Scaffold this active site. Structure first.
Site, mmCIF file in Angstrom:
data_model
loop_
_atom_site.group_PDB
_atom_site.id
_atom_site.type_symbol
_atom_site.label_atom_id
_atom_site.label_comp_id
_atom_site.label_asym_id
_atom_site.label_seq_id
_atom_site.Cartn_x
_atom_site.Cartn_y
_atom_site.Cartn_z
ATOM 1 N N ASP A 161 0.843 -1.192 0.000
ATOM 2 C CA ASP A 161 0.000 0.000 0.000
ATOM 3 C C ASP A 161 0.879 1.243 0.000
ATOM 4 O O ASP A 161 2.103 1.198 0.137
ATOM 5 C CB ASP A 161 -0.874 0.115 1.281
ATOM 6 C CG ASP A 161 -2.088 -0.835 1.334
ATOM 7 O OD1 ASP A 161 -2.472 -1.462 0.315
ATOM 8 O OD2 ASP A 161 -2.718 -0.905 2.435
ATOM 9 N N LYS A 162 0.225 2.384 -0.102
ATOM 10 C CA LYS A 162 0.916 3.666 -0.031
ATOM 11 C C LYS A 162 1.848 3.797 1.173
ATOM 12 O O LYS A 162 1.441 3.611 2.318
ATOM 13 C CB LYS A 162 -0.156 4.751 0.105
ATOM 14 C CG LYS A 162 0.406 6.103 0.355
ATOM 15 C CD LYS A 162 -0.673 7.116 0.783
ATOM 16 C CE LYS A 162 0.017 8.379 1.315
ATOM 17 N NZ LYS A 162 -0.755 9.113 2.362
#
EC number: 5.4.99.-
Length: 296
Positions: A61-62
């Site tokens: 994820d980010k």
């Protein structure tokens, strides 16, 4: 040159990207650009990655880092491929290993670590909430006792996030989870939590960590951990993604010669970025200030 399927062991600091796979650029953008520039793949395979049979093991994820991401793809096996690819990457992304594989070659069992400031474990009332806080042996015992409760197979339905209504049954398996002894860099103390498990759900590790922080800091009684297994919904705090690092993926494929490089990159590129961001931007400190919002 000859077209072959290969697999890469890749590492990266996640800050400044929006994840591994496609609004910041993604790690795969940097990799696809390096592949195109290096001549490993034609432009149209960078434009449509499906055409080089590109696959990644973990859709990080980010902001999430990785010491041991693995991808596979088909390339022209140019000379010095590894050095050429790396020469087009910034220093905080590195291809650490590269092997040619059969073409019969194509992820769920993983080890992550989570690096956090130790004041995440400082009791709201009994300890100082500043960076002079130092983890006691007693508090580290409490942390490890609570983390060990996660081992085994449990209904982790409160440790994920749904768009719609929560799914009441989400059994998952955790092999190990613990917190290492702390260390100090310029007066700031950190520790590394490691977890090994299978089929981690969205936000699962961040909420597993967030709940133990909430308990240990004094917002929730320990009972909440066993209670969170139950059918009732519990609002489990979700610790930030910054500290999270994908360490190892398990599937045959043997990355043993590359362990020294994996360690060196975590130490030189991954951890300093997390530490520096906690120091300069106070991500953990700000997140902890939100804990009172949870109804326990």
């Amino acid at each position: 040159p000859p077209k072959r399927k290969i697999v890469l062991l890749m590492a990266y600091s996640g800050k400044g990207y929006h994840g591994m796979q496609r609004q910041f650029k993604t790690i795969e953008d940097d990799l696809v650009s390096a592949l195109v520039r290096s001549g490993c793949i034609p432009e149209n395979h960078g434009e449509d990655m499906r055409k080089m049979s590109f696959q990644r093991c973990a859709r990080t994820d980010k902001g999430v880092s990785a010491a041991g991401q693995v991808v596979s793809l088909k390339v022209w096996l140019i000379d010095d491929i590894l050095e050429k690819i790396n020469s087009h990457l910034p220093s905080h992304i590195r291809i650490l290993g590269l092997k040619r594989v059969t073409g019969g070659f194509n992820c769920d069992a993983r080890t992550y670590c989570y690096l956090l400031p130790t004041f995440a474990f400082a009791h709201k009332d009994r300890d100082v909430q500043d960076e002079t806080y130092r983890l006691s042996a007693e508090t580290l015992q409490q942390v490890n006792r609570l983390l060990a409760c996660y081992k085994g197979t449990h209904n982790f339905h409160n440790f994920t996030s749904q768009k719609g209504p929560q799914d009441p049954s989400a059994c998952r398996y955790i092999l190990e989870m613990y917190c290492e002894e702390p260390f100090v860099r310029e007066g700031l103390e950190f520790a590394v939590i490691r977890v090994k498990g299978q089929s981690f759900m969205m936000h699962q590790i961040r909420k597993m960590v967030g709940l133990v922080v909430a308990i240990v800091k004094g917002y929730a009684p320990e009972s909440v951990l066993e209670r969170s297994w139950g059918t009732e919904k519990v609002d489990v705090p979700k610790a930030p993604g910054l500290g999270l690092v994908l360490e190892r993926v398990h599937f045959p494929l043997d990355w043993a010669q590359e362990e020294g490089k994996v360690a060196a990159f975590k130490e030189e590129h991954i951890y300093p970025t997390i530490i520096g961001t906690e120091r300069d931007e106070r991500s953990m400190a700000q997140w902890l200030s939100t804990l009172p919002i949870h109804n326990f």
